Structures are given as C-alpha cells and as structure tokens.
Amino acid sequence: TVPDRDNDGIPDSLEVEGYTVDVKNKRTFLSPWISNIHEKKGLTKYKSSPEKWSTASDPYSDFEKVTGRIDKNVSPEARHPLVAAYPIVHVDMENIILSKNETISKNTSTSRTHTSEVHGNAEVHASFFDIGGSVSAGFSNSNSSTVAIDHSRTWAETMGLNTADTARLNANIRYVNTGTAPIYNVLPTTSLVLGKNQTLATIKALSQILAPNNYYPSKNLAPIALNASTPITMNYNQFLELEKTKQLRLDTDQVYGNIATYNFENGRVRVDTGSNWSEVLPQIQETTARIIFNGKDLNLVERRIAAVNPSDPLETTKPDMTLKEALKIAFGFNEPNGNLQYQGKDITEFDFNFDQQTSQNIKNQLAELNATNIYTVLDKIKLNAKMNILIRDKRFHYDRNNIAVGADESVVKEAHREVNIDKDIRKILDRYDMLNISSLRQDGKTFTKENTIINPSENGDTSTNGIKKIL
C-alpha cells in the first residue's frame, strides 16, 4: 500500500519531506530529494501539499505540473507545485484616431497598471476606513491598463467641433496575456474609462488560443479596431478632458473561457465545458501570495506563490514559504554566492513595498529575528496567504500607477553614453510637442516622460525652455 491522501500521484512521505522527477532509460521517475546526486545532476527541489490535490488551487494537479502531464502552454515557472498557473489579461492600445460624428491620429503606449494607495490628503468616503467594505488594502485583485496618447493646433478645432458637436473615438487594440495559464475561447469583457469613472464604451468579442506571455491578435497578423455596430460617442466637454490629459484607462474583468484539462489514460488535452476559470480563479486569489516584479522589463508582472495560512488547517498542509525560495521559483532568481540576484542585478538594487497588513506581518517577524534590514533575514522571512508584495527597480522613479516614469541624471547619461542606447533605460524617455525624434531600429540602436508637457502652460508656453532637459 502507498500512502497518498490527495491521490495526485505523489505519496505523503515525498510530498512532505522532498521530491523531484528524473529520466531512467526514457521513462519518467518520481524520487525523494537527495542533494548528494539530484542537486549535482541539476534538478529542482519540489515540495507540495499531501491533503490538497493542487497546492496552487489551480485546475492542474501537483503531479501533472512536475511530471509534465499538463497543458504545454502553461509557463515553465508555473510547472512548479508552489507556483500558480492562472491567467491575467489587459488590453494594449497601439494607436488612436479621432473624427467628428457622421481627423487626428496619434500612436498610443500601454502598460499594465497596479495602482498604489492614496497619499494623505486625497478625499475618501466614510466606508474607506470602515472594516471590511470599500478598503483598497494597498492594491486589489483586478486588471487595469493606462494608455498614453502621443502629444507630438487645438484638437477641438483640428476636427471642427463646438459645444453642440460630438466627437467619435476609434482605436487599434490588442489582447495580451501576462499570466501563467492559457484561455482557449471566450475573451474577457473590458471597459474604456475617461479620467476616473466616466465609462466611454464596453468592448467584448472564436477559438483562437491566447498563450501566456503572447499576444491574441499575433504580431504577424493585423490587430483589432473599435466598433466599425455603433462606435464610441464623446461630447465636446468630455473631449477637452482627453485633449488636456492625453490619456485613458482600460478596465478588464477576470471572467475567462473554459479550461483545457489533461486526461491520463488517453494522454490528450481536451477543453472541459464543466470547469471554467471564474469558479477556480477566486480559490487561488485567497490561498496564494501576490508578488509583483519588473526585472526583465519595466512592466508590472503578477505571479502568485502557494502560501501558508494559520486560520485554515488545509492551507497549513502547504509547505512553509520563504521569501528567498519563492522569488527564485516565481521569476528566476539565482543564489550564486549566497546573496539573491535576478540574472545579475542584486536583491539590494530592488525596492520593497507592501500593504497595511502585509508590512505589519513582516514588522513583527523583523523584531523577532532582531535584524531590522529585510535583505539580512531574506532567507528567514515567512510568507502568508492573501499577501500583496510589490518589488520595483530602485534605478527608476514611480507614479501612483507604479509604472517607470523617469530616472536620475546619472542613469540616463549611462545608457546614452554609446555612439546605441539600452532598451530598459530608453523606456522612460522648440515647442511643447516638438519632442519625438527617437526612431528605434531593429539592429538594437536608437536613431523623460515625467518631465515632458502634453499641453502648453497657462501662459501658452510652446517652448522647450520650461521643459526639464537632460543629455
């Protein structure tokens, strides 16, 4: 008799102590962890929950992940039992076009936004403080992306509009997956928001596969336009807000199409009509810990790691999570000397941000561990469920949406030093509009956003004198 409680394929003994997958002649073999041979061979130390079928609480089993009997599209980092295989998709706008109802056209830049808490002056209702309801709790579980219209006379007059006249908006949009799991059919509903709450239009579209870290209207094919039955309608007064801000918001929901599951006896992946993402996704968002990171690119990446919870006993069955090991399996951190580093960039080079309860939980730990610095007790900091952790590069400056806006004069001059400019540094890069000059070539050579002016001053300053200029 083999002792297995979760009936996954991994016994209680290996699931608790440690295990890995190896190849004999060709056949896949599950064996307990031995540092004397497995670690030296180049294998991963796996540990999951013996009472939970899926530690990550996702539709794919712990066994399916490690053996490889999973949907091949599922992220390699997600092929670990302690890493959540779940999808997240935001709408990326490529360009806009504005005309009078029956023409100005500018290219747009979109990045996934993870909003940070209000300062200490911003107006909030009585329920914002009320325990339970309305509390933003640092950052909440949702998909939202902010666009940026190219600033490069008077849009209200370039089209020929007046207080009575209405302007119709049309743009080129693309669906793009930032998660760990694939959506095989139904696309989520999205809504274009002007300013804060002014809902302009609701967009919702098939059997085209949306792969993780891959675009839906694939770059090799043409993208999608906006309603060409009835297009977006905007009044003159709301149009002047768009001309003044030169930006919009895109709020996309987490309701996705049916999940394709693996079947052991026939070794084939089939789209299961029964299990949908909407019934499994909240289970993950309540058991796992959220960690945000922008190492490879200055874009906010959401990855969830299987975390322990003291209240629920079934979540206590999940192996104890450390900040060190979690960061390694979730993004790709390496321990060469003893200090953690992401592909070269040291852990100390990255900023540590948390919410109300997350920071307070770590506050108690830092006092019990005595060491006041987070980098010191990095390997001993315990991770709890429902936690929200934001890790960003110290080299750049961040706004309320936590996106890379600008950098120090030492930073800009370092990449712009070559005859060639770095791709990560250039991302934060005589008139208010006469600024677009950079034309990035495919060879890797270029031929701040926080300091630039989208509209002239109260004095109508159509000059580069007031604009904060660098080398």
Next chain:
Amino acid sequence: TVPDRDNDGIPDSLEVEGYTVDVKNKRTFLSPWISNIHEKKGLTKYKSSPEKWSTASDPYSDFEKVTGRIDKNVSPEARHPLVAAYPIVHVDMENIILSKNEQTRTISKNTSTSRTHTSNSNSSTVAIDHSLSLAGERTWAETMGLNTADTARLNANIRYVNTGTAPIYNVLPTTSLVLGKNQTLATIKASQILAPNNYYPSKNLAPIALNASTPITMNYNQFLELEKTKQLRLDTDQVYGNIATYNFENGRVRVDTGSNWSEVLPQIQETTARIIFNGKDLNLVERRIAAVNPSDPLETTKPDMTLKEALKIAFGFNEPNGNLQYQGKDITEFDFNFDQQTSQNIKNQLAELNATNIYTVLDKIKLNAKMNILIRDKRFHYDRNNIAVGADESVVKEAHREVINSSTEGLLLNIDKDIRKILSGYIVEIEDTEGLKEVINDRYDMLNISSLRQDGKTFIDFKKYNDKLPLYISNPNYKVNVYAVTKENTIINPSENGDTSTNGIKKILIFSKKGYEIG
C-alpha cells in the same frame, strides 16, 4: 468500523464530547478536545450534530468546514460548525441624478446607503444629499422645469454588496426601488464572483447605472414626496445563484447546478437563531448561530448554545478577565433587544437563574431556535430602521477634542470614524466679545463642510460657503464658534415659513477657540 451517523467524517464520539483540527508533519488530523495541549496551542473547541451533515443546515458540511475542504471565500467566523455560512446582499446607492423626461436643468446629489433591519428579508434605505448643487438652486420641481402634467425621470449609480458569510457565483437577486412605503418605482435585475464582505462592482472598477432599456418614470405629485423626504427604499429578495461545491479526490471547487441557495436558505432560517451586531462599524450585521430546539428531535442533536460562546464565534468577542468584550468595548457598553417570544423565553430563564441582570448570567443564558436578538452600541441613538442617527452632546465633544491644524482657511481635526458617522454637518459662525452671533454658513442645506482625508483626519473647510474666501478676523479677541449638527437634528427641507436658517437647527458646541488661538 467507525461509528459515524452523519457520514461527514467526524465520529459520534468526537461530535458529541469535543474535537479540533491539528497538523502533524503537514497532514490534517482530527482529534478529541484536550485543554492541556490544544487550548494552549491556540485551537478552537468544536462540537456539532452527529445526526446532521451540516449543523447550521447550510450546503457546506460540518467536516468540510473545519478541515478546510471548502469554498475558501466562506468567512473565517463561518468556518466554525456552529456558525451559518449563508449570503445576504443589499443594494448600496452611491449617487443620484434627476432630469425631465425626454443641459443645466439636472440635479445631482450623492447618496448614502446602509442595510436596514426594521423595528427576515433584505431592505436598505438611501439618503439623498440636502446640500446645494448649483449656486442658488431652489425647489427641485422648478430647478428641472416641471409642472403637474410634466414627468421626472430618475437615474442613479448602484452597487451590489454582500454582508453575509457565503459567496454567490453567478445570478444576482432581484431588487425593487420603493418611494415612501409601498409605491414601487422600478424593479432591477441584471459570472462575476460576489465575495462575503466585498462589493460586486469592485471599488477599483466603475459601478452600475440604472436603465440607460426604459428608465424609472416618476410623476410631478410623487416627485414632491421625494423632494420633501430626500430618501428612498431598496427591497432585495433572497433568491441567489447556484452554490459552488468541493470534491474530495480532486480537491477543487465547481459550481453545482443541482443545489441552489433558494432550497437550502429557508432550512437555516428555521433551525438557527438570529443575532444582529454593529461593533466594528455602526452598520447592521446579520449572523446566524446553530441553535437548539425542543420540538424537533434532529435539532436536539445540535450542541446546547450559550449567549457567551455564540457571540465569541459569530463576531469575535474575547474573554480576557471573565467579562465579555468586543476588541476592547465591554458587553455592558452594548444594548440588549429582543422580540415578543425571544424576550419572554429569556424572562423565564432570568427568574430561574434568579439574577435579574442579563450581563450577570451571560454565560448561562440558553439560546433557542428561530430566536431574533438585536445588539446595538449604547453610545448612539436609533430610529425605526435601527440605524445610528445621533448621540449625546458629551460623546460628540470627545471625538472633536483632538486638534491638528488651526487656520482661517480650514480646521483639520483627528475626529473618530465611528462618531463622525452620525454627523450631518457643522455650523460656521463668528461670536463677538460684545455678544453678537453672526453666522457665515446660515441655511437648511449649508451644512456639508467636513471633507475626510485618507490620513485619518476630518477637514472642516469654511471657504465652501464663504465664497472661496477664508474667515475674516474683524477682531482677534472674538470667539470663532464652530458647532456640530447630527443626522437626527438636521433639516432636509425648510419650515412652513421657508426657514432657510441654521438658528432652528439643533447645534452642539464642538469648537470655540478664540481668533488669536488660530490666527
């Protein structure tokens, strides 16, 4: 063979005497209650019904709960066998907008909604802002340009919000907007997950509007009732979408099409006892505890319920000395209210226990099935809908004691969040050394001035009605009197004489620092 009557997993022996859940290496283990080891480790003493699958009569079994093999969204207080995991949802209105049936003939005011439990069902009463929208907007019936023949069309921003213990995964309940008492205006009904103690159109996303196929239609005569009351009612039913269940071998939760909330919810509403509490916030919270019943033998199988232990597991009461207290606030600081038969049942108990005070025999008061108990904070006053309206003059002065900033432009003060909830506005006036009471903000609507900052301090701005200008210091020796007006004392409309003055409004002295103490 294991003696188990309810097939849950918990045997008859543990289910009757006592049990808890612990972790060995990693594995979950069910063991009988031992105070010498378990109580010290930080565990909860569980006891349920050996003949009932679910003691609370809910869709989630006694085992599924404590073992954690359940819908993770289910409230932590509800994860206990003697606590009901059931949903309750009311409609919260954020703001309204009124226009004539078809540019500047449109009135828009922000609304405040709280769940009302009139002194079982879901009902919520809204409150339309009485304060000015335009510079000199007078008579709503004329601000839009309506007459006896003309009709006014209502539109508002609404949000669905869960106050229960269980989640609804799809179908939203039907709701109806009621003017006054029975005048049914409109009936509203829409795979987004509604989590307990969480909003449906999540705060990070935009809310929902009201019919933009056919909107709400109101006649001139019914519009004058809305202008006079400045309030509406929202009656929502308990018919909800299908419940998501757990499967043991696959440890994943799927939405069961077979079992719906409408078939299981009434079973709970007949087996458990109702207890209402507003500790954390002055909002009415409905929580049901598994209660005993002499008539039904299957309900006699449920462990005997005490007022002490029930309050602890249902809301979060703690016993530090021996006296029960909610996060600090003592049991005596809370008022005890019951119905006809509930109070009469406890009346007999109090005489048998001899002690006439409920707080004395608190640990010995037995709880019966179908009981209805209302517990409210003694600090505040309560209306017919049992919601916090006002408080004693003394209590208001305690929260407005903490002064952060003293300026002619504004007054930033560290006012308590629970106390400020019964506040409608404040009166701004300059009292002479001579003895003259000249009032700046002097009208029936000129009351909204408090602007709560995210830092935790309420900002009082006099410039709001002082034509965007700070208070003029005619003499620095003069007393700058800033009062306080409760929600129960404020006037939504002027008197028969057209009283557009703060003189008649019951004002509570809250700030009286002289002109030189500020600037």
Next chain:
Amino acid sequence: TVPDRDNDGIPDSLEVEGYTVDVKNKRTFLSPWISNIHEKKGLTKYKSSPEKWSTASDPYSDFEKVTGRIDKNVSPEARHPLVAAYPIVHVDMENIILSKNESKNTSTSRTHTSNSSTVAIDHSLRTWAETMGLNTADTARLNANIRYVNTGTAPIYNVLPTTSLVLGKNQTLATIKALSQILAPNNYYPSKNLAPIALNSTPITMNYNQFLELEKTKQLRLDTDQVYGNIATYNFENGRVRVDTGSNWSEVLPQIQETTARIIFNGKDLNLVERRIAAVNPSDPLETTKPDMTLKEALKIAFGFNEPNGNLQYQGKDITEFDFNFDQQTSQNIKNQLAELNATNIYTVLDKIKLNAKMNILIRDKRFHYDRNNIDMLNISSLRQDGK
C-alpha cells in the same frame, strides 16, 4: 435481521406495537413505547402504517416526520405520522380602490360553504355610481391590494396557484396568477415587513349594471385552485433539502384527499382551519394497515387538544363548548356507532367514536353565529395593543 416492509426506517415491530423518539448523549433514538419512563418523561406515543411509506400519503415518510429529517417549515402538529403535511392557500384582500376607466379597506377569511375566500368592503365614509361620475354607458375599473396566505401544513417553494375574482355567484371578473419566494405554513407570501401585491397588463373591467351589484352587496369572492409548485424533499445520505422537479403537489394532493378524514376547527381564532388525519378504510386493505383512529386522539394531534381530568379541552375551552357538524354519509356512519355504543351523546362516547376515510367533519363554536359560508356612520372601534 429486523423486519421492515415500508423501508421508511421504523420496523413492522414498532409501527404496530408503539414507539417514540428520544435523545441519548445527543443522538436520536427510536425505541418501543415504555409507560414506565417515556410517558413520565413527556413523550407522545407514535403509531403508523408498516406497509405504507407515508401513512398520511404525503411526500414525506413516516420516519422523516418523527426523527425530524423533514422540511423544517412543515407544521409541528404535522410532524406526527397520522397528521397530513399538505398545503392550502386562499387570497386575502387588504383594501380596494375604484375609479372610472381611462377607497375602502377589505377583510378576508377562508370560507367553507376546494379553496374559496369571501371579502368584505368597508361601508363607512354619496352613491358610489356618482362619487366616480359613471352612467349606464360608462365603465368602472377595479384595483385592489391582495396577499397570498398559507393555512395548510406544508410549504410551496415556487409557482403560485391560479385564483379568480367572482362577483356575486358566478360572474367571473378576473383571473390572477403571478419567482422563488418561500410560502411557509401559517405565514403570508408578501411578508408583513414588505409591501403587498396590487392588481394588474390590463386591469379588471366592470360595467355600470354590475357595479351597482357591488355597491349593493359590498362583498366579492376569491376562488383559488390547489395546483401548487414542486415539493422540496429531504435526502438521507447528504442531510440536505432539495426542490424535487419530479414530484409536484398536484400528483400527491388527491391521494391524501382520498385516504384521510377532514376536520375543521376555529379554536385559537374564529377562522376555518383545514387539517387532515390518517383514517382507516374497510374497502382498501392498504388503508386497513393504518392504525385505528379515534375522535379523541385525532383532535389532540391535529389541533392541540389536552386531556387534564378526562374531558377533552382546547387550551381551556371544553369539548361541549364546541358544535358538531357532518355531511350525509359521515353523520350516518356515526349514527350507527352511537346506537351500538348506546350513548346518544357524542361527548359521552368521545373516546370510542371511530374515524373513517373521506369523512368531512366541521367543529365550530356554539357561542358565536355562523352564516352559509360558516363565518355608514358606525366605524369608531380603534383596538389598542393593551387588549381594549
């Protein structure tokens, strides 16, 4: 092995001899009737049909009722195997409002001359036909506030029965028919804490000639059918109540109305209450399996009669204080019994009068006055909560 024919849970041994339900540690226990302890503890002696799964022929078994593994909404008096757990619902009108085609408060009570209820329009504050401004050609449109109210023993979970408003005797004015709101026994559908229901796509239309009949009588009739929504059943293995789409009330309701005896009583309130008791039938052998029914024990379990001295009394009011009414065959069946028992008085041989199936008995208060349905400056009475 223990013999069980109906498979209900209770064996053929107890169903004939006698049984009661008791609590050990917490666990429910079914044991044979022992007067030495069970009678002294305060338990009620149960006895059902060993071959019939449901003695009352209702969707809930003999076992489901006594153990408590039944729909909790089901009446406590109905939790006895010899008492029928079946619903009866009439329409209660609260107030009326009359206007010309383009207000008085009403009182309604269930009438037992099927479900039928007669309303009473307030006569108190000239010529209704002229107060609205109508003539022989003009038509009057009726609108009223109505409420569905359960008088039975079982709950309806969804579909509401069809009802028809009748002027006078047969003049059918309008047919009303409405959801998943639970209608609990002895509880209102549009719950008193919420707003009631109004009357109508197209409203009720009445001619001038028919309007003068309503002005002269100041009363109407409400005929409601017995077709109700699907019954929610209990499932043993998962201990949860689920609405069974298969079994409806319309297929089970007549089976009860052919096996049980009907007894009407107005003790607690002067409103006609319909309650059915499991009765014996000589023709059918399966109904002979049901325990022999007595007038004494039936009245006790159906309404709440008590035997303190030896004489039966309802919460204090003696059995003699209530009148005894029957039909053609019911009275004739008891007529033979009274002659065989020799005692001509029904109150004498009260404990020996046998009850048969399909019987119809009406028990009303002797003190008060009853009509055929067995129920302007004058309004001044304003009843205070003190009881005066």
